[PDB]
């Protein structure tokens, strides 16, 4: 589901939280990129098991299925962490809770009539093109 | 507390909440938006307030158990839709 | 109907044929009624009274003159056409109730009594004790007010079907 690399930077600062502060890690956004001279080698090594660099309908449907898989796995991880913090095994991480609050704030409303009408309009346009 | 399904708060609701008659819920919501506590708009013609955000804060164990329940539901829905799509498209998945 | 040629004409036949037609009316089997009419001779439907009377009753009923079909109780060609008229009365009241169902938003008790012919007013609760469209006799009976979500799962099923038919090698 995810990349093989997790990045951490050691930050030690007085917790504005007001809690005892200990020198611990903080996650850093990570990505996989390649030089061109490394892209050539990577592609050559993967030539036999490579996928098409184009969206073929079967592969696009498969990509959507994999997206659903990833979303389910992430939601399961969050639910397990919530279980643990609720029961008491782990402490309440305020940044985690803030981000979860923002996520639930960000969930859309799909039963709205003004949205249902636009959705049906766009679906009909796409279906007439099809 | 209000879920995104029916986050349309009403003037009467805010009146039954912190004690004020419905002639300054408008000003109170204006102050909230200006300070940055919430986001959205106020349709005072229909006498309701649309909230599309809240400033997150720190919560309680029960407030997190509620979030756990909501997740449980969301995970169930995602898994059901995943199974449906996978079974339906089984013959074209690469 | 089978051995018409060999057997002779039965003068005591059309009475029973009309009796069966009236029974079909009463049971509300209109399709069978019309198949029976088609089986019958074309001339008889007009020349005769025994067959014509059930034909006229069904004609009134399907035209919608419920008052006329009620008034047509008296003209019974023979006494045999009895208690079938009563089952037909029950069926007529059921049909009127179906009209009230599919139409007539917000109907009242007095007009309902006048239209859907009930028994004595003390028995006016009939068909509300049995058919009972959760009437809720709110004085006016409200007709119980008897009479927005994306079907995303179904639409996704259809779209995946399109993708399947496009991607299958055949």
Using alpha carbons, list the distances in angstroms from residue C23 to B31, B49, C52, C61, C143. 78, 65, 14, 14, 32
A113 and chain C in contact, CB less than 8 A: yes
Closest CA to B44 of B9, B20, B17: B9
Chain A residues lying within 8 Å of B72, measured CB to CB? 79
At residue C17, what are phi and psi to the nearest 5 degrees? -60, -45
| Nearest residue in chain B measured CA to CA from A83 | B68
Chain A residues lying within 8 Å of B73, measured CB to CB? none
Count of Cβ atoms closer than 10 Å to residue A83 Cβ = 16
**Two tokens, residue C35:** 């198949």
Closest CA to C37 of C6, C4, C11, C14: C14
Q: Which helix (H) or strand (E) holds A11?
A: strand A7-11
Closest CA to A100 of B58, B32, B33, B80: B58
Contact C127, C96 (CB under 8 A): no
d(CA A72, CA A66): 10
**Two tokens, residue B8:** 């349309």
A112 and chain B in contact, CB less than 8 A: no
Q: How many CA atoms lie within 13 A of C103 on its CB side?
A: 4
Which residue's structure tokens are 């001339």? C43
- Method used to obtain the model: cryo-EM
Determine whether the interchain pair A58/C167 forms a contact, defined as Cβ–Cβ distance below 8 Å: yes
d(CA B60, CA B63): 5
d(CA A124, CA A119): 9
d(CA C44, CA B81): 65
Q: Which of C150, C155, C162 sits opposite A110 (nearest CB)?
A: C150
3-state secondary structure of A119: helix
Rounded to whole angstroms, the maximal C-alpha distance in chain C is 74
Resolution (A): 3.1
Sheet holding B8-10, edge to edge: B8-10, B48-54, B38-43
d(CA A114, CA C6): 75
**Two tokens, residue C135:** 């009437």
A115 and chain C in contact, CB less than 8 A: no
At residue A106, what are phi and psi to the nearest 5 degrees? -85, -10
Q: Which helix (H) or strand (E) holds A70?
A: helix A57-87
Q: Which of A62, A68, A102 sits opposite B82 (nearest CB)?
A: A68
Instruction: Locate the domains of chain C by residue range.
Output: 1-165
Q: What is the DSSP letter of A28?
A: E
Question: Hey, which chains touch A, using 3+ CB pairs under 8 Å?
Answer: B, C
Chain B residues lying within 8 Å of C160, measured CB to CB? 85, 88-89
CA distance, residue B8 to nearest chain C CA (Å): 18
Q: Which of A83, A98, A101 sits opposite B68 (nearest CB)?
A: A83
Dihedral sign, Cα of residue C34, residue C35, residue C38, residue C44: negative
Alpha helices (H) in C28-142, listed in sequence order: 30-39, 44-47, 52-63, 66-71, 84-102, 109-115
d(CA A42, CA A49): 11
B79 and chain A in contact, CB less than 8 A: yes
Q: Which of C148, C150, C166 sits opposite A57 (nearest CB)?
A: C166
Chain A residues lying within 8 Å of B54, measured CB to CB? 101, 105
Determine whether the interchain pair A57/C163 forms a contact, defined as Cβ–Cβ distance below 8 Å: yes
Count H helices and E strands in chain A, helices first: 4, 2
Dihedral sign, Cα of residue C75, residue C80, residue C85, residue C91: negative
Contact A47, A39 (CB under 8 A): no
Q: Which residues pair with A27 in a beta bridge?
A: A8
- What are the contacts of B62-66 at 24+ separation with CB within 8 A? B64/A82, B64/A85, B64/A86, B64/A92, B64/A97, B65/A86
Using alpha carbons, list the distances in angstroms from residue A4 to A62, A68, A81. 22, 20, 21
Closest CA to A69 of B65, C148, B81: B81
d(CA C126, CA C140): 16
Q: How many CB pairs under 8 A join A and B?
A: 82
List, as one string, the DSSP characters of B20-86.
--TTSHHHHHHHHHHHTSEEEEEETTTTEEEEEEE------HHHHHHHHHHHHHHHHHHHHHHHHHH
- State the virtual CA torsion across B79, B83, B86, B87 in degrees, nearest 10: 180
Dihedral sign, Cα of residue C148, residue C152, residue C157, residue C161: positive
d(CA A70, CA A73): 5
Contact B72, A79 (CB under 8 A): yes
A21's CB contacts (< 8 A; 6+ apart) are: A12, A13, A14, A15
A96 and chain B in contact, CB less than 8 A: no
Determine whether the interchain pair C162/A130 forms a contact, defined as Cβ–Cβ distance below 8 Å: yes
d(CA B85, CA C153): 9
């Amino acid at each position: 589901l995810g990349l093989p690399t997790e990045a951490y930077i050691s930050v030690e600062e007085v917790h504005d939280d007001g809690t005892p502060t200990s020198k611990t890690f903080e996650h850093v956004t990570s990505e996989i990129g390649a030089e061109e001279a490394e892209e050539v080698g990577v592609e050559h090594l993967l030539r036999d098991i490579k996928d098409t660099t184009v969206g073929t309908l079967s592969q696009r449907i498969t990509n959507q299925v994999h997206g659903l898989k990833g979303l389910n796995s992430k939601l399961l991880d969050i639910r397990s962490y919530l279980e643990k913090v609720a029961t008491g095994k782990l402490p309440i991480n305020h940044q985690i809770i803030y981000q979860l609050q923002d996520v639930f704030n960000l969930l859309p409303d799909v039963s709205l009539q003004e949205f249902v009408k636009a959705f049906y309009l766009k679906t009909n346009d796409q279906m007439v093109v099809v | 507390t209000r879920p995104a399904n029916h986050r349309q708060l009403t003037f009467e609701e805010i009146a039954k909440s912190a004690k004020i008659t419905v002639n300054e819920v408008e000003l109170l919501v204006m102050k909230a938006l200006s300070v940055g506590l919430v986001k959205g708009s106020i349709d005072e013609v229909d006498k309701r307030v649309h909230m599309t955000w809240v400033q997150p804060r720190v919560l309680d164990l029960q407030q997190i158990k509620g979030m756990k329940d909501r997740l449980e539901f969301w995970c169930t829905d995602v898994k059901s839709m995943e199974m449906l799509v996978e079974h339906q498209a089984h013959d074209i998945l690469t | 109907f089978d051995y018409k040629e060999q057997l002779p004409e039965s003068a005591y036949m059309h009475q029973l044929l009309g009796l069966n037609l009236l029974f079909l009316l009463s049971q509300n089997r209109v399709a069978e009624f019309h198949t029976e009419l088609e089986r019958l001779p074309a001339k008889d439907i007009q020349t005769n009274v025994y067959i014509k009377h059930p034909v006229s009753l069904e004609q009134y009923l399907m035209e919608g003159s419920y008052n006329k079909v009620f008034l047509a109780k008296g003209n019974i060609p023979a006494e045999s056409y009895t208690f079938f008229i009563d089952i037909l009365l029950d069926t007529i009241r059921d049909e009127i109730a179906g009209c009230i169902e599919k139409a007539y938003e917000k109907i009242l008790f007095t007009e309902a009594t006048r239209i859907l012919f009930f028994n004595t007013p003390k028995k006016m609760t009939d068909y509300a004790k049995k058919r009972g469209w959760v009437l809720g006799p709110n004085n006016y009976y409200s007709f119980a007010s008897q009479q927005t979500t994306i079907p995303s799962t179904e639409l996704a099923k259809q779209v995946i079907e399109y993708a399947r038919q496009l991607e299958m090698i055949v």
